[PDB]
Amino acid sequence: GSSGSSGFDFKAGEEVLARWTDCRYYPAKIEAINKEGTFTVQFYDGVIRCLKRMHIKAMPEDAKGQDWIALVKA
Numbered sequence: 550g551s552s553g554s555s556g557f558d559f560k561a562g563e564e565v566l567a568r569w570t571d572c573r574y575y576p577a578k579i580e581a582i583n584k585e586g587t588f589t590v591q592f593y594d595g596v597i598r599c600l601k602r603m604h605i606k607a608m609p610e611d612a613k614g615q616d617w618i619a620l621v622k623a
Contacts, residue, residue, distance in 0.1 A: 556607060565590065566606045574606065
């Protein structure tokens with residue numbers, strides 16, 4: 550526990566962040582899941598590589614927009 554539960558949904562075509570040859574994170578998307586014991590991903594440049602879950606993260610709501618966090622009905 551002690552780390553939240555706000556989301557964990559991952560699928561082929563989902564947009565994500567990943568660590569690259571450069572230590573900074575960058576906008577990417579999932580191309581495949583467990584297909585080669587790894588997560589295949591594609592970057593905005595068009596390049597495709599395979600990584601572990603330990604090098605990939607879900608992007609924030611600020612990277613997508615039009616969210617509903619703390620905007621419940623009344």
